[PDB]
């Protein structure tokens, strides 16, 4: 259906529900993941310019959270809504700040700060929400 | 796919993820819901006569209410997508009379403003359903 403000908000709320749940409950599995460190590299190497690299590190990081659950139902539900997540993601001009947020999120994860990592994930997702709605209004 | 122990666990974990999220974030909307009190009535009726048709309906209505309270169409449709799977797992719950009792206490904690206790009771209920269904599955 139409990609209006409500559509965006629902997408982000769904992501918050699924990703926070997985990060909270599989925090240790995520923190000890070899993939997590691979992604850390992508997030650094990336120079402000290179979007393709941001979008790929972004997809990998958030899908990792979900995948860490080992729960095939949850994994496939997230896959079902990925194209919708990606469409919303296209309105995020501020995707260099997102990258910064991922850098800090991963750092809080690796340093054992679970509550801070959950806080940062929620903030990141709400920031994406705010940025995308802002941008949609201009068109 | 096969309904094995893992299938059941994944179902319950998915329900915990979605239902707790909705109960926590839309607690007030749920507590002030007219539907909630309608369902309370049904639950006092299952206590009277332990009829399965009536439990299953009150059970579906109560947990779908939590989800629906979000006003989030994506979340609502995702829950609908997995409902038949939830209902298949639910068929192995023989002691649904205890579930009904748990719903009675859950709704009371909701109506009495005890959010943390309501969330605790919902998680407990779902993990109890999990344990019961797996026990049952392994007798066949």
Place of tokens 């719950």: B93
A43, A102 Cβ separation under 8 angstroms: yes
Euclidean distance between CA atoms A37 and B38, whole angstroms:
52
Euclidean distance between CA atoms B5 and B136, whole angstroms:
10
Question: Residue A82's CB: how many other CB atoms inside 10 A?
Answer: 15
Q: Count interface pairs A-B at CB distance under 8 A.
A: 44
DSSP assignment of A17-71 equals: HHHHHHHHHTHHHHHT-HHHHHHHHHHHH--S---HHHHHHHHHHHHHHHHTT--
B103, B45 Cβ separation under 8 angstroms: no
Contacts of B78 in chain A (CB under 8 A): 14, 77, 80-81
DSSP assignment of B12-37 equals: HHHHHHHHHHHHHHTHHHHHT-HHHH
Topology of domain A1-139, CATH: 1.20.120
Q: Which residue of A has its CA nearest to B14?
A: A74
When CB atoms are compared, the residue of B10, B72, B82 closest to A14 is: B72
Q: Is A28 annotated as a binding residue?
A: no
DSSP assignment of A75-132 equals: HHHHHHTHHHHHHHHTT---HHHHHHHHHHHHHHHHTT-HHHHHHHHHHHHHHHHHHH
B124, B16 Cβ separation under 8 angstroms: no
Q: Locate B120 and state its tokens.
A: 């605790």
B76, B67 Cβ separation under 8 angstroms: yes
Q: Is A109 on the interface with B (CB under 8 A)?
A: no
* Secondary structure (3-state) at B137: helix
Q: Is B85 on the interface with A (CB under 8 A)?
A: yes
Domains in chain B: boundaries: 1-140
Long-range contacts of the stretch B54-61 (C-beta < 8 A, 24+): B55/B96, B55/B97, B55/B99, B55/B100, B56/B90, B56/B96, B58/B100, B58/B103, B59/B90, B59/B96, B59/B99, B59/B100, B59/B103, B60/B87, B61/B35
When CB atoms are compared, the residue of A11, A13, A71 closest to B13 is: A71
> Exposed e or buried b for every residue in B55-79, given b needs 16+ CB within 10 A?
bbebbebbbbbbbbbbebebbbebb
Q: Is A58 annotated as a binding residue?
A: yes
Euclidean distance between CA atoms B8 and B135, whole angstroms:
11
Q: Locate B9 and state its tokens.
A: 């666990």
When CB atoms are compared, the residue of A69, A71, A77 closest to B78 is: A77
Contacts of B82 in chain A (CB under 8 A): 73, 77
In 3D, which of A82, A127, A68 has the Cα closest to residue A100? Answer: A127
Q: Locate A115 and state its tokens.
A: 């509550």
DSSP A139: -
Euclidean distance between CA atoms B6 and B41, whole angstroms:
35
Residue A40 CA neighbour count, 13 Å, CB half = 15
Could you tell me the CA-to-CA distances from A3 to A24, A89, A114 in Å, in that order?
A: 30, 12, 33
The residue numbers preceding gaps of C to N over 2.5 A in chain B are: none
Euclidean distance between CA atoms A32 and A109, whole angstroms:
9
DSSP assignment of B62-123 equals: HHHHHHHTT--HHHHHHHHHTHHHHHHHHTT---HHHHHHHHHHHHHHHHTT-HHHHHHHHH
Residue B25 CA neighbour count, 13 Å, CB half = 16
A125, A19 Cβ separation under 8 angstroms: yes
Way it was determined: X-ray
Q: What class, spelled out in words, does domain B1-140 have in CATH?
A: mainly alpha
Euclidean distance between CA atoms B13 and B8, whole angstroms:
9
């Amino acid at each position: 259906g139409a990609m209006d403000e409500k559509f965006i908000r629902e997408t982000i709320e769904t992501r918050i529900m699924m990703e926070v749940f997985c990060l909270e409950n599989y925090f240790d599995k995520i923190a000890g993941s070899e993939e997590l460190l691979e992604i850390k590299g992508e997030i650094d190497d990336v120079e402000k310019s290179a979007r393709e690299i941001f979008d790929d590190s972004d997809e990998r990081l958030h899908k990792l959270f979900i995948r860490a659950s080992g729960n095939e139902l949850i994994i496939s539900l997230y896959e079902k809504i990925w194209d919708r997540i990606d469409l919303v993601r296209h309105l995020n001009e501020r995707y260099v700040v997102s990258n910064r947020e991922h850098k800090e999120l991963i750092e809080r994860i690796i340093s054992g700060d679970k509550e801070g990592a959950i806080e940062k994930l929620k903030e990141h997702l709400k920031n994406v929400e705010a940025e995308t709605i802002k941008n949609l209004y201009t068109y």
